[PDB]
């Protein structure tokens, strides 16, 4: 034990999204991917999920009293 950390023990749920399907749901958050954070294909964000140049993950943090915090990261090289 103690070996390594991450700020949470835990991890969120990570869904690939299609540019299309990410396109709305970023929007529909209020808000477009050139404004959220973008991790390169370099960065282990591709290694993860397997995501590709150009492909956008689903994060979904859950909290007390029902809070769901959702967060797009568009994988570009």
């Known amino acids: ?4 950390i991450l700020k949470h023990q835990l991890v969120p749920e990570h869904v690939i999204l299609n ?3 990410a396109k709305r749901v970023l929007k ?9 954070p973008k991790i390169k294909t ?3 964000v591709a290694k993860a999920i397997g ?10 943090r859950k909290s007390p009293t029902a809070e769901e915090f959702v967060t797009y990261r568009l994988v570009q090289d």
Request: negative net charge; glycine residues 4%.
């Open 1 to 4: 034990m103690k070996r390594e």
């Open 19 to 21: 540019e299309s399907e």
């Open 28 to 36: 529909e958050l209020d808000a477009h991917p050139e404004q959220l």
């Open 42 to 44: 370099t960065d282990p």
């Open 51 to 60: 995501a590709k140049r150009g492909d956008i993950v689903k994060i979904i």
